[PDB]
Amino acid sequence: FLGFLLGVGSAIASGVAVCKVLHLEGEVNKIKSALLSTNKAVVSLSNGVSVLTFKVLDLKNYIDKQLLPILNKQSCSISNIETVIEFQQKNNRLLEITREFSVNAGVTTPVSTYMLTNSELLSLINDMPITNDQKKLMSNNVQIVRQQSYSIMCIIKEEVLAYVVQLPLYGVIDTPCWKLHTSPLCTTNTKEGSNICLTRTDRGWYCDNAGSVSFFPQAETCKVQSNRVFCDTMNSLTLPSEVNLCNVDIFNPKYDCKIMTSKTDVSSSVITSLGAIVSCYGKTKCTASNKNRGIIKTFSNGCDYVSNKGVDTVSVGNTLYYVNKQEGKSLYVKGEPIINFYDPLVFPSDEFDASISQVNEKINQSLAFIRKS
Amino acid sequence: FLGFLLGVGSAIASGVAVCKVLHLEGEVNKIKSALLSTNKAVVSLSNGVSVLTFKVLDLKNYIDKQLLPILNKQSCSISNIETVIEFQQKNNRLLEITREFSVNAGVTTPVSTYMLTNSELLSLINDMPITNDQKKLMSNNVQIVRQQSYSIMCIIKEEVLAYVVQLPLYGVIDTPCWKLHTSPLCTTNTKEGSNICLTRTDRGWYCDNAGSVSFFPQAETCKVQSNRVFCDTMNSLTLPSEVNLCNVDIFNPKYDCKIMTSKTDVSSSVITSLGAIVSCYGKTKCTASNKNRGIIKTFSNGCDYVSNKGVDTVSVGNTLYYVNKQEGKSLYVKGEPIINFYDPLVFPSDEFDASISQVNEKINQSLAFIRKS
Amino acid sequence: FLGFLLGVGSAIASGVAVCKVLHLEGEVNKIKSALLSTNKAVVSLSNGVSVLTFKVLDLKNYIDKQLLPILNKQSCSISNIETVIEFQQKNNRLLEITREFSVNAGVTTPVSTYMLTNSELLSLINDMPITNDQKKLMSNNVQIVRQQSYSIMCIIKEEVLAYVVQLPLYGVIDTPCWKLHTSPLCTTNTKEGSNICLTRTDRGWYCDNAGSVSFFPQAETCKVQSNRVFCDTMNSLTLPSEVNLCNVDIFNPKYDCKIMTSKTDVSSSVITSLGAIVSCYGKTKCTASNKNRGIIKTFSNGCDYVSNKGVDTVSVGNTLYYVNKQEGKSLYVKGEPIINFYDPLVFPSDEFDASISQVNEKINQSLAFIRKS
Amino acid sequence: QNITEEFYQSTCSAVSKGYLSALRTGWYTSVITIELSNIKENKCNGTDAKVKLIKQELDKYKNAVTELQLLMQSTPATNNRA
Amino acid sequence: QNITEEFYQSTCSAVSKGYLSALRTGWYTSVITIELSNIKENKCNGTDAKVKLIKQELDKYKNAVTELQLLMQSTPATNNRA
Amino acid sequence: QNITEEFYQSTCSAVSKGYLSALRTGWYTSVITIELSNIKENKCNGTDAKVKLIKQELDKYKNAVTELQLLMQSTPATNNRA
Numbered sequence A, B, C: 001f002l003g004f005l006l007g008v009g010s011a012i013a014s015g016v017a018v019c020k021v022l023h024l025e026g027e028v029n030k031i032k033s034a035l036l037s038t039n040k041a042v043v044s045l046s047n048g049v050s051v052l053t054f055k056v057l058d059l060k061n062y063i064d065k066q067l068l069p070i071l072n073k074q075s076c077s078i079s080n081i082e083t084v085i086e087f088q089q090k091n092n093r094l095l096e097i098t099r100e101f102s103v104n105a106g107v108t109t110p111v112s113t114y115m116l117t118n119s120e121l122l123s124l125i126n127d128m129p130i131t132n133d134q135k136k137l138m139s140n141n142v143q144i145v146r147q148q149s150y151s152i153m154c155i156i157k158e159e160v161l162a163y164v165v166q167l168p169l170y171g172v173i174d175t176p177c178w179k180l181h182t183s184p185l186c187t188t189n190t191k192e193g194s195n196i197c198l199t200r201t202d203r204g205w206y207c208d209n210a211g212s213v214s215f216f217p218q219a220e221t222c223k224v225q226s227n228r229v230f231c232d233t234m235n236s237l238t239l240p241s242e243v244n245l246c247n248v249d250i251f252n253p254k255y256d257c258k259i260m261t262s263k264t265d266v267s268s269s270v271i272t273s274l275g276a277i278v279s280c281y282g283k284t285k286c287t288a289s290n291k292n293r294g295i296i297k298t299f300s301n302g303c304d305y306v307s308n309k310g311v312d313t314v315s316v317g318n319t320l321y322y323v324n325k326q327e328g329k330s331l332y333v334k335g336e337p338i339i340n341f342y343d344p345l346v347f348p349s350d351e352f353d354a355s356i357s358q359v360n361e362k363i364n365q366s367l368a369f370i371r372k373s
Numbered sequence D, E, F: 001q002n003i004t005e006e007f008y009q010s011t012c013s014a015v016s017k018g019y020l021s022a023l024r025t026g027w028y029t030s031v032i033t034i035e036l037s038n039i040k041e042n043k044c045n046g047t048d049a050k051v052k053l054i055k056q057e058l059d060k061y062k063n064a065v066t067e068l069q070l071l072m073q074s075t076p077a078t079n080n081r082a
Ligand SMILES: *[C@@H]1O[C@H](CO)[C@@H](O)[C@H](O)[C@H]1NC(C)=O
Pocket: A360, A364
């Protein structure tokens, strides 16, 4: 929800600065030299950036040493298909890299196999100035490293093609993360509408990071494997650790908990890691079923939860949800719905991006006029 | 607009559960056996899911029976290019499936041709436990079936590669659908600003489904052919059939019609199925033209409509819109703009996600203080 | 921010109308004839649209004149691989175009190389009825022309495959553009919360166009090269030129400046073209550093700016931003923060999509009750 | 001058100036064609490996046409409403 | 009738009628398999160009398997929460 | 323990606990190169089919370079502002 609150930055800005340097004055020859003896070499830029350079595919030594005698004539008398196939094969990668840059106006993401192969990528990781453990992490999650990487087209100066592959660095590893799932909380009165709602807006991923908590408002941006949560700090907000108070106590003074108000009595379900939150309102059919046994729980009006244990499916109206079948324990923490603490009249029904105290100020303000007048 | 109101679920959760089963204990051999006699076979999982299995591409019997005699030496004396080309061709699909999974971290959508070809897909449809009519529908809309499908990478256990293709089931067919297009309704006073607006927020696709109406708030999510509307019920809200009252009567007691308020006197056009809605305000040039004849209608300030009949284009300020050229009749239903019923002072100008009664409560509340004080 | 304010239209509606004409009655033969003598020809449709037609790839004259003698037997006695390779090569494009349409349900964007190659595209541009200068622009920005183009599958009538490539026309060129970056403005009181915020909502691209200003609310939609800004007028709003008053004077009577209010005291940075805006609030670490030298500026609570000159990085909490290294001068325009002009009580804290006067009306309204009661 | 920027302290906003427009106004509709052939399943014993590759690629071409033919009906989308 | 439209002047809204549904309700899970081989790095001098192309494509197949094998562990994503 | 969940009845929210971070903080810029050749349109009669395929693929390589050369100027995008 809170996605609009995020700042802005250019992801490719570091890789772009490497292109600026690769142009002047010239530096292309500096790396062409370094890549004559080996297919891979570390190079220090005049800028002073120590950059790992790779000679993936050498078309020069193939066209010059295998195709050039045939065309520097005369008459192309000698030829063989075992060379036409070998050339078609060799050339393809350049053709496929060229295809990719032509649609993505010289900046691709994820970094494709043609841009950098698995063996090339795993070698690049293993030759990076990173921790022994950090190398293992990246190698075991290449699929993610590719999705979090960028490929920037740079230049074709003198006899050379250069494109910058910009790979992630994980400065925060093995710190505790948690996912907060929120759904609307509404009064369950027997009337047409005339119901008041409240929804926690703070839904998203949360990670302890440098004494604060990194908040990912659009949980849709993070990639998750098993325990492992892969995020980009650019898609975060850095909040005080007291943000976690809103879970146990939303009325705490230490942190003003982000909520939104409505009269939108709409039914829905949120599928969590280990269960399902059901926001059931009106004349809606809200159910949790097991494949073989059928309906195992019928949800009453209000907000409830069901654990994945022995539940495969949750149905809210005409919508069917498959619950995640992950092994883990869940805890129901019984409590009086926060919405019951509010007088319907004098309660501010249209706060789009509010908080507990904002709502409480508005309640007093409105209340005072009725009493003072 | 109302997209934020939707619930959450995992689309691949069913296909993921098939991967869990395909791993244990082992079940890979159970299907390897079943796919020795035929290239396609129905298999019942220990789970008891009856799953259609397909042996698309058999690289074993090609490498073992055509390439193995050459390399189980010695000396690779015998060789022929008619075999190098045949192998390059055969291998490519595995290479192209591997490419796809490497960027999409093992989950692709739409399901590509390399993942499942048209002949394979049309055969899969024709061997599904679905209605005679339902088979025709899917076969005639393969392009859609592909966009609504998922391909999940599973495992490579013993000599086998398995990936799950998860295809849609259309439990609701041939039920009436309708698309609601909304635009802002504003007062047209000759002043700088000081105008009040209202916009129906309920824009989207609507389908009668099981006694209720399935509402698709982001009409951008549905795929449409001709008459046919293809939707995913996960992108819906299930509303009472009385939601259709807001069209004919927005003031009806039976349903509280979702509206939003502003003082945002901004010009725009919405291109409908058979015409164009024009919200013309301020000093804006709002026009409807025919290619050959030029300007055929000049819109006055306020919200109006023009039918596609003899209209190719609609221009609102510096923006040109091409109207849809579909054959169909449209009906102008004359009525006093709902915004004229509101006293500008005492009218709540910033309701982001409201409804008629919410607005009416706020109007009374504010009105009472002026009268009672 | 203001993206929801945009109108709606169908981009492919013009190209779709060409498909309707290409079907009847028949018109396919009219173009088959015209494309017998040349591989490229201008054709006037019965509709009267003068459309450039291209015969890219002629599979008929290859299968009929090079493969047909072999299969119109008998016995396929004569054959050669130099023909199997030539055919595989020739056929591939049709196969790759077919792949593309199968996933994109017959409508692709960007227009791929297989759909239209660079040499084909550059020739198409050079044969269009456009200005000498307009030809240069498009040819120098093909990567953009591709991203702004659509490829619509049409028909395979009699011996022919036709797909419409719909290319942009730039009716507005070399007019001044500017980008407005906004960040939240908040009070910096030493209390837990109890702070009031304000944010300019008008962020986006702005271009002078036909006496008005074309506003692109989602600056994320525009493609930029160097000076050059490429936009689609469909993603714009057409505003009076007085919108630029909000920059120099947000309190001006001529235009009601779009702002939003909150109590959301959240830290962030916005990376601009030539610097960085820092919105620093609470206990957040807000800094600007140089690679070699480290921290060069520590931001105090409130909204500030730092120019890219000698700054490579900006850090707001746990988030690092790379500043753009573009050469250009920036100007700090000192001024009293607009939020200091507001009494915290009686200030409307939750205006999601407001403006200066809306806020000012609300302030008076609330103020009057306290005074009159 | 060229690219220049002004930061407004009072509003917490900055304007980047010095850009030139290239705004899409119209459209140019071009008809791209591929001239194909209408051979029919020819039948031959030809067990030759060079022929079977030609038979393999010819099936690929034939299926592509059938695919594209099925791809037509109905008319395009285009997922509107935003 | 078929496609018809009604414009409501009072609400600034229009309803397009005459459509038929095809709403995704369930799912059909199919297991697609590729039967592969388990050869081991065979060693031969074979300097022949026809062989080295076969050696080149065989390495491509072997690497693809290794890639797909590494692609497994852990289980899929799928970037939820909207 | 590992993955655990707590549902808060009073707030209609649930927290999934037991995860470990891998947050992208920095960037590693690597320069990937392709060493190419600078042949010039060689002219030969060579009507040989094996040669014309080599001539066909050589044109593909030459055009790719020209494409990539045209692809440079100006510098990258990247569609910012969110
Ligand atoms: C309003 O709530 C505050 C707590 O924030 C309380 O101190 C005050 O007494 C309430 N209104 C009054 C003073 O009547």
